Amino acid sequence: VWKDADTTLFCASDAKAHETECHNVWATHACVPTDPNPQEIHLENVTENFNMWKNNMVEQMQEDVISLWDQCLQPCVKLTGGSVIKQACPKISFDPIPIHYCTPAGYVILKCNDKNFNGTGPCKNVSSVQCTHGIKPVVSTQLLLNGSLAEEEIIIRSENLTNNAKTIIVHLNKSVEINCTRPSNGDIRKAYCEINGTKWNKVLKQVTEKLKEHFNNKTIIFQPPSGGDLEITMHHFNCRGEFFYCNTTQLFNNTCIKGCNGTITLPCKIKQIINMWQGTGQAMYAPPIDGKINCVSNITGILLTRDGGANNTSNETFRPGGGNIKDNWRSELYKYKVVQI
Amino acid sequence: QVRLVQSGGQVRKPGASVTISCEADGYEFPDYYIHWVRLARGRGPEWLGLIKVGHGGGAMYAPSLQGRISMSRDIHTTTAYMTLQRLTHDDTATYYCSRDNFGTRPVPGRGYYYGMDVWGQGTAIIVSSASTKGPSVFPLAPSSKSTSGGTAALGCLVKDYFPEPVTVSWNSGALTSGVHTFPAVLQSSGLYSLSSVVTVPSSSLGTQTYICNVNHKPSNTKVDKRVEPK
Amino acid sequence: EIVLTQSPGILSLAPGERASLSCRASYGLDTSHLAWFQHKPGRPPRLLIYGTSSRPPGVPDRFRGSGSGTDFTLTITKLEPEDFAVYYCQNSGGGTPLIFGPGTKVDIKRTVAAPSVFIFPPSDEQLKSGTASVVCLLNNFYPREAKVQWKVDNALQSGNSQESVTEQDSKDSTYSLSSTLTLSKADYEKHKVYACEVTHQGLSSPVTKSFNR
Numbered sequence: 001v002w003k004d005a006d007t008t009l010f011c012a013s014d015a016k017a018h019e020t021e022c023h024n025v026w027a028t029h030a031c032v033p034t035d036p037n038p039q040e041i042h043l044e045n046v047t048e049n050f051n052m053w054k055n056n057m058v059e060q061m062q063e064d065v066i067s068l069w070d071q072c073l074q075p076c077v078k079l080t081g082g083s084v085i086k087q088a089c090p091k092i093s094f095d096p097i098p099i100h101y102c103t104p105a106g107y108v109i110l111k112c113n114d115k116n117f118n119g120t121g122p123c124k125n126v127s128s129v130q131c132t133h134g135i136k137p138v139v140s141t142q143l144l145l146n147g148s149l150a151e152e153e154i155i156i157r158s159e160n161l162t163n164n165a166k167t168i169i170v171h172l173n174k175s176v177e178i179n180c181t182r183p184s185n186g187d188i189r190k191a192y193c194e195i196n197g198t199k200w201n202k203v204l205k206q207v208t209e210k211l212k213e214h215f216n217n218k219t220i221i222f223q224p225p226s227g228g229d230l231e232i233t234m235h236h237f238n239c240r241g242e243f244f245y246c247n248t249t250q251l252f253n254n255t256c257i258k259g260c261n262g263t264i265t266l267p268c269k270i271k272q273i274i275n276m277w278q279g280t281g282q283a284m285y286a287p288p289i290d291g292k293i294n295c296v297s298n299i300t301g302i303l304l305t306r307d308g309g310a311n312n313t314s315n316e317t318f319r320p321g322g323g324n325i326k327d328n329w330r331s332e333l334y335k336y337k338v339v340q341i
Numbered sequence: 342q343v344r345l346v347q348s349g350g351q352v353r354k355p356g357a358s359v360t361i362s363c364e365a366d367g368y369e370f371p372d373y374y375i376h377w378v379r380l381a382r383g384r385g386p387e388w389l390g391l392i393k394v395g396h397g398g399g400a401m402y403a404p405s406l407q408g409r410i411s412m413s414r415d416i417h418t419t420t421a422y423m424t425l426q427r428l429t430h431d432d433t434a435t436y437y438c439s440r441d442n443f444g445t446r447p448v449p450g451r452g453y454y455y456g457m458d459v460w461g462q463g464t465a466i467i468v469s470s471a472s473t474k475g476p477s478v479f480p481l482a483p484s485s486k487s488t489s490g491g492t493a494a495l496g497c498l499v500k501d502y503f504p505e506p507v508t509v510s511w512n513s514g515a516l517t518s519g520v521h522t523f524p525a526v527l528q529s530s531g532l533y534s535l536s537s538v539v540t541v542p543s544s545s546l547g548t549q550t551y552i553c554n555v556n557h558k559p560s561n562t563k564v565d566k567r568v569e570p571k
Numbered sequence: 572e573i574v575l576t577q578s579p580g581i582l583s584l585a586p587g588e589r590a591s592l593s594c595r596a597s598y599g600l601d602t603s604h605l606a607w608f609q610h611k612p613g614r615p616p617r618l619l620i621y622g623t624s625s626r627p628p629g630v631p632d633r634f635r636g637s638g639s640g641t642d643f644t645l646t647i648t649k650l651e652p653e654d655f656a657v658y659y660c661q662n663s664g665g666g667t668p669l670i671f672g673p674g675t676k677v678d679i680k681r682t683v684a685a686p687s688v689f690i691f692p693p694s695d696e697q698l699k700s701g702t703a704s705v706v707c708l709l710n711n712f713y714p715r716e717a718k719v720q721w722k723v724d725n726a727l728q729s730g731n732s733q734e735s736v737t738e739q740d741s742k743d744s745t746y747s748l749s750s751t752l753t754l755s756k757a758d759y760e761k762h763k764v765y766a767c768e769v770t771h772q773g774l775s776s777p778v779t780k781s782f783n784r
């Protein structure tokens with residue numbers, strides 16, 4: 001009745017018309033309202049093959065968030081390959097809202113409902129929907145924030161675990177709150193995040209046990225990022241329109257897997273000059289706004305990179321990636337694929 | 342016009358380091374990773390590392406070079422860089438940079454493809470302790486041990502010069518038929534050396550003068566060696 | 572990891588024949604991670620085939636690739652004169668390291684031709700400087716495989732010689748090899764017989780070119 005196909009999608013959102021928040025402003029003209037009667041039909045005895053890493057829905061969402069960021073966060077100075085653009089840079093309200101991705105006529109979206117589905121291969125419990133769930137376009141590195149959780153066990157996602165040049169997406173089944181704050185007042189860009197070290201090390205031990213199931217019970221070792229921009233060597237994210245940069249060596253402490261029960265406090269910094277995650281160059285913004293800048297986020301996933309050359313070695317090394325924001329949408333679009341009727 | 346321009350050739354002492362730049366032009370620099378590959382004399386290409394220029398600028402290096410090689414990228418100036426430290430004699434090669442989709446984007450008509458399609462012009466890195474030295478030309482004289490049925494072989498030994506290259510001609514260019522100028526081999530002394538030979542009729546050994554003309558532009562040395570039967 | 576093997580070392584065909592080059596993958600990679608390259612001296616490597624069987628724009632249609640995942644083949648339908656070069660396969664994505672294969676040299680077919688072997692004693696001008704170089708010339712031979720053995724008073728020399736081969740001549744499709752045996756003036760004056768033993772497909776018996784100091 002159907003076959004796999006690629007086509008242009010459209011977005012739907014619950015963006016209010018009079019909101020000044022910039023995800024709303026963009027979605028009011030780039031998306032339609034949400035269907036109040038979502039219809040999901042379960043396919044009896046149907047097996048479909050999914051591939052979250054070769055999914056065109058991710059390319060289309062990436063092109064949306066790029067468009068959404070060009071309209072919203074225009075920097076004072078843009079530096080993109082020998083073109084200096086000086087511009088106005090007004091502070092904005094920036095809180096991501098969920099974006100639904102819907103399919104046009106003649107096509108439909110197949111959703112995978114296997115609780116243990118890792119992202120590739122067959123899916124036993126498939127249903128048919130017209131739109132995806134509400135996916136917030138949260139742009140971050142190292143830690144996936146504010147996403148969905150796995151329904152049963154922790155899920156390790158990768159196009160090929162044997163290929164060390166492929167990103168690993170860890171999908172947690174228990175959220176760990178991260179509470180970041182720029183205190184109100186010597187250094188206006190000094191900030192910090194707070195994580196329950198008891199809840200985090202308990203989850204971090206579980207992801208190492210899950211990685212051991214994929215690497216012949218070898219010793220799992222974590223190490224900090226080996227190089228690159230500060231956007232990838234640090235937990236990078238944006239809060240209240242301010243670009244944060246947090247050091248996460250305390251978050252991947254191998255010895256904690258015992259003074260580990262306390263509160264982990266990551267030293268952060270707000271930077272005006274950033275490397276755009278679009279990969280297009282440098283961008284300078286205005287100094288941070290006054291007052292307490294605070295964001296409380298759910299840690300729902302970890303982006304990892306594995307060091308190769310562990311053939312005869314009895315251990316595996318893992319480092320936090322990675323500056324490919326298309327992996328962020330894959331962490332939510334993995335169970336979806338578009339087919340033509 | 343898609344193009345990549347590298348910095349010029351360099352000569353470095355053993356133990357020193359070298360940094361090579363790679364400037365992109367004619368395409369969108371953020372859209373492609375950049376690899377570094379070298380080719381040494383008489384050896385296949387060796388992949389040194391790649392730079393994820395569009396995904397944070399991180400780099401992955403070859404295991405045999407980790408700790409010695411370093412790569413990075415600047416997007417605003419569309420330049421990739423490579424630095425190799427503790428240079429040894431084995432590091433003498435032509436170093437190349439190349440762009441690659443590396444499966445990051447589904448480019449139209451090609452998919453999530455992998456392939457270094459555009460390469461820089463190459464940078465010659467010569468690791469040696471020697472300084473600019475002119476060649477000493479020695480004769481390869483023809484004789485009974487150099488004759489075989491009407492034809493005779495003679496030549497010149499262009500030994501102990503640095504650096505490359507030397508150009509060798511015979512009789513000011515009037516003699517080309519039968520000439521074989523061999524590629525120079527970097528001796529253990531750090532100085533290059535090659536031979537240029539030519540086959541001529543044995544009857545002409547007593548009537549025709551054979552002079553090899555050696556020019557070494559780096560040292561500004563020009564030698565004309567008359568080769569006589571021994 | 573992945574270990575790449577290419578066979579044969581030298582593939583010898585006439586201009587116009589079909590060429591088939593083998594590239595073996597030890598552990599076997601994804602078909603999207605096997606590329607082919609052409610290399611001519613003085614030029615950067617040229618991407619001919621990406622993803623096992625695809626051609627980038629500007630690559631002639633006679634170049635064709637195929638592979639199962641662990642065994643790969645590059646096909647040249649009709650060999651043009653500019654196609655005689657070295658061809659490497661590469662692990663383009665399934666690394667790292669993104670290893671290149673050892674390479675296969677495609678040279679021009681020819682009837683077997685034995686080398687003209689010449690030996691050159693060291694000059695007196697060089698002998699006065701303290702070094703002695705004995706040159707042995709293998710002239711105009713085919714195929715490329717040639718074995719040169721230096722013997723000083725019937726003693727097999729090993730690590731004191733260097734070989735240099737010219738590119739295949741475009742007219743007669745032959746090769747030329749030079750072998751230089753370097754010795755100090757002291758060691759040279761101690762020994763009498765200096766020989767050059769050549770082994771080639773065109774010679775029924777190994778030819779020895781020798782002289783006495």
Ligand SMILES: *[C@@H]1O[C@H](CO)[C@@H](O[C@@H]2O[C@H](CO)[C@@H](O[C@@H]3O[C@H](CO[C@H]4O[C@H](CO)[C@@H](O)[C@H](O[C@H]5O[C@H](CO)[C@@H](O)[C@H](O)[C@@H]5O)[C@@H]4O)[C@@H](O)[C@H](O[C@H]4O[C@H](CO)[C@@H](O)[C@H](O)[C@@H]4O[C@H]4O[C@H](CO)[C@@H](O)[C@H](O)[C@@H]4O)[C@@H]3O)[C@H](O)[C@H]2NC(C)=O)[C@H](O)[C@H]1NC(C)=O
Pocket residue numbers: 151152153154155173174205206207209210
């Ligand atoms: C978030 O995800 C994590 C994973 O990343 C979850 O933690 C996992 O939870 C699963 C269960 O949902 C555990 O899997 C089970 O493991 C059983 C054996 O484990 C024992 O050995 C391992 C080491 O080899 C120890 O680590 C375990 O001990 C620890 O955990 C247990 C509880 O899990 C504690 O009690 C201990 O104190 C330790 O803390 C154990 O000693 C394994 O038997 C079981 O498999 C059976 O059941 C499953 C379904 O659950 C069946 O599919 C399967 O076929 C098996 O059924 C067989 O046996 C039953 C009877 O036993 C028969 O009826 C059947 O016919 C059949 O013969 C399962 O694999 C996993 O170990 C655990 N991992 C970690 C690191 O904690 C979190 O719970 C999850 N959190 C949330 C909130 O969702």
Ligand SMILES: *[C@@H]1O[C@H](CO)[C@@H](O[C@@H]2O[C@H](CO)[C@@H](O[C@@H]3O[C@H](CO[C@H]4O[C@H](CO)[C@@H](O)[C@H](O)[C@@H]4O)[C@@H](O)[C@H](O[C@H]4O[C@H](CO)[C@@H](O)[C@H](O)[C@@H]4O)[C@@H]3O)[C@H](O)[C@H]2NC(C)=O)[C@H](O)[C@H]1NC(C)=O
Pocket residue numbers: 092093094095096138145146237238239240289294295296297298
């Ligand atoms: C992961 O997801 C969580 C939950 O979605 C996010 O948490 C949200 O964080 C944002 C800030 O980034 C919070 O937004 C803040 O709301 C405050 C409350 O405003 C409401 O209520 C007041 C009265 O109490 C009304 O007057 C007002 O109209 C609203 O109804 C605002 O006061 C904050 O704005 C302040 O600062 C901004 C600029 O920084 C100024 O423009 C404002 O004038 C004001 O001074 C702010 O908008 C939001 O409340 C949080 N959600 C929840 C449910 O608590 C995480 O941020 C998110 N993580 C990431 C990384 O995206």
Ligand SMILES: *[C@@H]1O[C@H](CO)[C@@H](O[C@@H]2O[C@H](CO)[C@@H](O)[C@H](O)[C@H]2NC(C)=O)[C@H](O)[C@H]1NC(C)=O
Pocket residue numbers: 118119120121122156157158159160161
């Ligand atoms: C995700 O799960 C699928 C199975 O649901 C795994 O696919 C298997 O892959 C191996 C090769 O590694 C094949 O031999 C099996 O036949 C596949 N199982 C099937 C098709 O049911 C896949 O490897 C898993 N990937 C990860 C990253 O865990």
Ligand SMILES: *[C@@H]1O[C@H](CO)[C@@H](O)[C@H](O)[C@H]1NC(C)=O
Pocket residue numbers: 042113114125127
């Ligand atoms: C199948 O998927 C549906 C929708 O997510 C879910 O409600 C149901 O429990 C699943 N059933 C099985 C047997 O997996």
Ligand SMILES: *[C@@H]1O[C@H](CO)[C@@H](O)[C@H](O)[C@H]1NC(C)=O
Pocket residue numbers: 146147174175298
């Ligand atoms: C955080 O995760 C919990 C479940 O652990 C969920 O109930 C809550 O809605 C999540 N909050 C956000 C902002 O996503």
Ligand SMILES: *[C@@H]1O[C@H](CO)[C@@H](O)[C@H](O)[C@H]1NC(C)=O
Pocket residue numbers: 179180181194296
């Ligand atoms: C976050 O931390 C601040 C103090 O740094 C605290 O006042 C606030 O209540 C915390 N919020 C949560 C949700 O824990």
Ligand SMILES: *[C@@H]1O[C@H](CO)[C@@H](O)[C@H](O)[C@H]1NC(C)=O
Pocket residue numbers: 233247248249250
């Ligand atoms: C992160 O902090 C640790 C100490 O907590 C420090 O050693 C490391 O250099 C820091 N990393 C960066 C990128 O600053």
Ligand SMILES: *[C@@H]1O[C@H](CO)[C@@H](O)[C@H](O)[C@H]1NC(C)=O
Pocket residue numbers: 249250253254255256258259260
């Ligand atoms: C790791 O934790 C131990 C205590 O469990 C602490 O002493 C050490 O400083 C921590 N190291 C880092 C890098 O956070």
Ligand SMILES: *[C@@H]1O[C@H](CO)[C@@H](O)[C@H](O)[C@H]1NC(C)=O
Pocket residue numbers: 159160161162163164573598599600601665666
């Ligand atoms: C994963 O990569 C390894 C080599 O890098 C390869 O042997 C294997 O076939 C790959 N697996 C898949 C499913 O592509």
